[PDB]
Motif scaffolding. Structure first.
Motif, PDB file in Angstrom:
ATOM      1  N   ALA A  45     117.382  98.009  85.137  1.00  0.00           N
ATOM      2  CA  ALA A  45     116.727  98.722  86.223  1.00  0.00           C
ATOM      3  C   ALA A  45     115.375  99.386  85.711  1.00  0.00           C
ATOM      4  CB  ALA A  45     117.671  99.720  86.834  1.00  0.00           C
ATOM      5  N   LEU A  50     113.403  98.054  82.770  1.00  0.00           N
ATOM      6  CA  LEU A  50     114.236  97.940  81.575  1.00  0.00           C
ATOM      7  C   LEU A  50     114.952  96.599  81.651  1.00  0.00           C
ATOM      8  CD1 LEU A  50     115.255  99.407  79.006  1.00  0.00           C
ATOM      9  CD2 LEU A  50     117.137 100.324  80.404  1.00  0.00           C
ATOM     10  N   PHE A  77     117.633  95.684  74.927  1.00  0.00           N
ATOM     11  CA  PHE A  77     116.998  96.136  76.162  1.00  0.00           C
ATOM     12  C   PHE A  77     115.537  96.491  75.800  1.00  0.00           C
ATOM     13  CE2 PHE A  77     120.477  95.691  78.827  1.00  0.00           C
ATOM     14  CZ  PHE A  77     121.592  96.279  78.218  1.00  0.00           C
ATOM     15  N   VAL A  78     114.586  95.918  76.534  1.00  0.00           N
ATOM     16  CA  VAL A  78     113.182  96.232  76.321  1.00  0.00           C
ATOM     17  C   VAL A  78     112.584  96.770  77.604  1.00  0.00           C
ATOM     18  CG1 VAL A  78     112.918  94.495  74.491  1.00  0.00           C
ATOM     19  CG2 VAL A  78     112.377  93.929  76.847  1.00  0.00           C
ATOM     20  N   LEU A  79     111.738  97.773  77.448  1.00  0.00           N
ATOM     21  CA  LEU A  79     111.013  98.353  78.565  1.00  0.00           C
ATOM     22  C   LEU A  79     109.737  97.546  78.765  1.00  0.00           C
ATOM     23  CD1 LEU A  79     110.927 100.774  80.559  1.00  0.00           C
ATOM     24  CD2 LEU A  79     109.610 101.948  78.828  1.00  0.00           C
ATOM     25  N   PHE A 126     108.571  97.789  73.227  1.00  0.00           N
ATOM     26  CA  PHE A 126     109.250  99.069  73.297  1.00  0.00           C
ATOM     27  C   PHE A 126     110.753  98.713  73.466  1.00  0.00           C
ATOM     28  CE2 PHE A 126     107.287 103.006  72.607  1.00  0.00           C
ATOM     29  CZ  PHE A 126     105.978 103.018  73.103  1.00  0.00           C
TER      30      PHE A 126
END
Lengths: 16, 16, 16, 16, 16, 16, 16, 16, 16, 16, 16, 16, 16, 16, 16, 16, 16, 16, 16, 16, 16, 16, 16, 16, 16, 16, 16, 16, 16, 16, 16, 16, 16, 16, 16, 16, 16, 16, 16, 16, 16, 16, 16, 16, 16, 16, 16, 16, 16, 16, 16, 16, 16, 16, 16, 16, 16, 16, 16, 16, 16, 16, 16, 16, 16
Positions: free
Chosen positions: AQ_1, BG_3, BG_13-15, BH_13
């Motif tokens: 999300a 995300l 998990f990468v932003l 990130f």
């Protein structure tokens, strides 16, 4: 017909 | 000063 | 009667 | 009609 | 502001 | 603006 | 020749 | 709250 | 109000 | 505290 | 028929 | 100045 | 009956 | 010489 | 923009 | 309304 | 050598 | 219309 | 004329 | 349904 | 509005 | 150690 | 925050 | 009961 | 028919 | 009656 | 300046 | 919950 | 000889 | 939002 | 401060 | 329901 | 001034 | 910020 | 700083 | 400029 | 009833 | 050796 | 409208 | 300004 | 409840 | 019409 | 999300 | 460390 | 708000 | 004339 | 940076 | 302002 | 039980 | 030496 | 193991 | 007019 | 500078 | 011969 | 610290 | 975040 | 968006 | 003779 | 922004 | 749990 | 040395 | 680093 | 991706 | 008549 | 380190 200033003391705006 | 009259109705009796 | 100041621009002393 | 400024002291916006 | 009426005759419908 | 009848005799149309 | 009318109604003018 | 009306007739006010 | 009339002929007044 | 109410209608107060 | 400027103080645009 | 009938339905008096 | 200011741009003094 | 006439009615001139 | 109607008489069908 | 006449004869005036 | 003549008629000069 | 509240508890305000 | 309305509730205007 | 600004001093954003 | 008439005969005006 | 709270409602303080 | 609403009709605001 | 000053920014006199 | 610009101060595009 | 400014390009002061 | 009449219908009583 | 400023003189930050 | 008409409705012209 | 109308009659506007 | 029941007949709530 | 100031000396803030 | 009620919950009985 | 139920009769949602 | 409790009844949970 | 009946079925008034 | 801008190239001010 | 005669009639020369 | 006459006799003018 | 609803799911109740 | 500013680009004031 | 949101969390915006 | 920017003052990147 | 978020809705930020 | 903490041990803060 | 429409939602035009 | 949770109710999962 | 439960493990009440 | 300031950058008022 | 700690959350120090 | 700043006045760099 | 005669024999004049 | 054992119960290493 | 020792602990002297 | 030694024999020092 | 160490030995630093 | 990360250890970024 | 040592760790000196 | 689950083995998990 | 920047080219990130 | 890392994903560095 | 040695005997160096 | 190594021994590189 | 002898040994004079 | 010897014989030096 006209507003005139008179002075003699005292003063007047006379409208004749 | 003088009393003047003008008008387009509205009438103005004006001094100045 | 009365000399009054009216304004709306323009202004005059008006005699009513 | 009109909102005008009258003065004679005191002043008011008058609706006529 | 408010439209108010007063009079001593002269009648004033006044805003302020 | 306004073409007005004006008098101060003598009368004229004046553009105000 | 120049008029300044102050008001707060109470009003006061200066005319020069 | 305070009004200053200028005139020379042509008129202009500042109201604060 | 308070009138002050200046003259030197030429005349000029202040009205407060 | 100390109230000072100004009026000229228009009213304005200072409270110290 | 014509708009002319007169001055004598005061000034006028006269439309004859 | 002028209190005018205005419409854009819906109608209102507006001070212009 | 009352002069109120509306704004939404454009603004109006509405007198209801 | 050089004439500059100011008017706002009221008229005032400078002549250089 | 909107076609609006107002009038104090003169009638204005105004766009803006 | 005020005149200043300069000279050295050659002369020049300013009238306000 | 220079003359300034003031007037408002009443007149006054300065000669240097 | 403006409030200043001082404190050190003991408190004092000035409201104008 | 030119309206500037200040607000922080409390509202205060300047009209030029 | 609409956020409108009212002013009468005090001001409000009214959401009707 | 504010009239400034220039003349040297030849005449030219500014109206603001 | 001294607090000044300003308000007009919107409020802001300075604490030293 | 601090609202400044400009109007000349047309309205424009600054919010700080 | 009591009118008190509350602040948290915004401030109000609150009646409890 | 026609959308025109009229001015007399105030200005509008008017539909005739 | 009135001298107005019309424009649609071309512009004229028109007497109505 | 001069009041002129022209028309292609629309009629223009024009000053300039 | 909340730390607020209360005043009635005396003032305190109160935890509620 | 040149006209600039500003508007925002409120309008103002400069004529040279 | 602002209109400048130029004229010399021939006319041209810029509207922003 | 305090909203008090007060009598001097006639009774009122007064803010002290 | 309203806090009003009465004065007759002595003064009161009456909350009706 | 006026006793007003508002709430988003917390309820404020506010004077101002 | 907050959409609040407000009453001073008459009730409104106001954005504070 | 310290959370303190006092009371004469009203209870104050005070920071300072 | 001109409000014209226009068709390309489908018809509309278009401002040209 | 309303002037709206359409674009699809070509553009139109449509007055419905 | 060179003459420049200005005119607008009123005339002025510079001779070098 | 302005004349500059040059000479050295041979002469040349510029008229604008 | 206006409360609008849109959604591709996420729903946005938007002011602007 | 609350008007908040959301952004992720695009931004909106959202009512929740 | 343009928003600048500053942040460091504490945030402040300017909207024009 | 999603990581979004929320502000209402204070601002945060919030993970939803 | 400082964020400036621009918006007109479309949004853009600078973070330092 | 904006915190400035001074220290030399001894510590003193300003909060704006 | 020449239309330039800016959009980012928000739309703003220049007409020359 | 760190994902933090706080809440007074509303819950914020915040990055920074 | 607000006493909040905060966690980043480890949890604390923080005054924001 | 006590509000203490921590700093490590970021700062916190922690209430243990 | 002389410590100055700035905080708005974010904290930044100067040590002299 | 960590140097942290505490403040409660007096301040400390504590190394735990 | 204003004569300036230069001499070093050789002589040359300016007449303004 | 110096890492010192400090006590005021409770003991800590403090950097002086 | 004269010593001034300042302190706030941090200390500094001036010896003359 | 900062030593300044004055000598003319006779010697005198300032230590800051 | 930046250190400037001055020396002449005697040393002094500024850390930002 | 556009990331610029500065490092000399110490790291600082700009995000546009 | 004077040393300035910069650092951010990376260090650089200027010795004069 | 978003995300996302990402894999290239190894998942994170990468932003974005 | 933490957002960290990785770079090896490409950057990420990563939120673990 | 001085590292500058550019990223838009894609990453590129300058090392001075 | 970069050595610059000045000599005129007397010698003075700059080291960068 | 490109390395320039300067030397005079003292050496410095730029890597892009 | 005045001599200035500089020295650092190397010597240079200026005699006026 | 620098000598300036003045003379007019009488002599005076400044040595720094």
């Amino acid at each position: 017909a006209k507003l005139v200033f008179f002075a003699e003391a005292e003063a007047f705006f006379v409208l004749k």
